[PDB]
Amino acid sequence: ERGKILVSLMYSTQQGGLIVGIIRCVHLAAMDANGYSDPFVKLWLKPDMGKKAKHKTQIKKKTLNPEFNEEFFYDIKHSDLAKKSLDISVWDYDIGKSNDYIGGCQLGISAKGERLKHWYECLKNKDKKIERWHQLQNEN
Ligand SMILES: CCCCCCCC(=O)OC[C@H](COP(=O)(O)O[C@@H]1[C@H](O)[C@H](O)[C@@H](OP(=O)(O)O)[C@H](OP(=O)(O)O)[C@H]1O)OC(=O)CCCCCCC
Ligand SMILES: [Ca+2]
Ligand SMILES: [Ca+2]
């Protein structure tokens, strides 16, 4: 068991871009010796591989159910966003050590189940926030 993450999507027509609302995560894997992790989420539109299109949340220190409530924005047209698969990666912050990898999940059309469904519902219903839970399982 390594938890799940509540993600929100909404394409704003007046602003022209995608709003990814990271709400929280629950029941994550304990990556530290104290029994916790220090989770923070990383968002990244995959096929660009350009650094001008990726974000990350603030470091929630010592919590297995972090409460982020952080929105991020990607300036991209609606036709160009249909090509994108937004990657999500939750990590554990170590203060004198490379960050432990907790989990991850990717939202795209080539994916299956709830990922393609969430991306698609984001693509169709605009000026409309769609929320969904996502199980971490990438092992990257
Ligand atoms: C260009 C030639 C001259 C320049 C020399 C350049 C030579 C060369 O090619 O190395 C570049 C390489 C790139 O490392 P790399 O891009 O993966 O560094 C991470 C990357 O930038 C992520 O995007 C960051 O996360 P984010 O942005 O926050 O999302 C992360 O920061 P943080 O999240 O951890 O804080 C970074 O750690 O760095 C090394 O030397 C390690 C390989 C050692 C090789 C060992 C193999 C034996
Ligand atoms: Ca750790
Ligand atoms: Ca830690």
From Swiss-Prot:
The C2 domain, residue ranges: 1-134
Tissue: Specifically expressed in brain.
Residue sites binding Ca(2+) 4 per the record: 32, 92, 94, 100
PTM summary: Ubiquitinated. Deubiquitinated by CAND1 to prevent its degradation.
Binding site residues for Ca(2+) 3: 32, 38, 92-94
Localization, UniProt: Cytoplasmic vesicle, Secretory vesicle, Synaptic vesicle membrane; Cell projection, Dendritic spine; Postsynaptic cell membrane; Membrane
Top-level division of the source organism's lineage: Eukaryota
Domain notes: Binds calcium via the C2 domains. The calcium-bound C2 domains mediate interactions with phospholipid bilayers.
Assembly and binders: Interacts with RAB3B, RAB3C, RAB3D, RAB8A, RAB27A and RAB27B. Interacts with RAB3A; this interaction recruits RPH3A to synaptic vesicules. Interacts (via C2B domain) with SNAP25. Interacts with deubiquitinating enzyme CAND1; this interaction results in the deubiquitination of RPH3A. Interacts with GRIN2A and DLG4; this ternary complex regulates NMDA receptor composition at postsynaptic membranes. Interacts with SNCA.
Physiological role: Plays an essential role in docking and fusion steps of regulated exocytosis. At the presynaptic level, RPH3A is recruited by RAB3A to the synaptic vesicle membrane in a GTP-dependent manner where it modulates synaptic vesicle trafficking and calcium-triggered neurotransmitter release. In the post-synaptic compartment, forms a ternary complex with GRIN2A and DLG4 and regulates NMDA receptor stability. Also plays a role in the exocytosis of arginine vasopressin hormone.
Name assigned to this protein: Rabphilin-3A
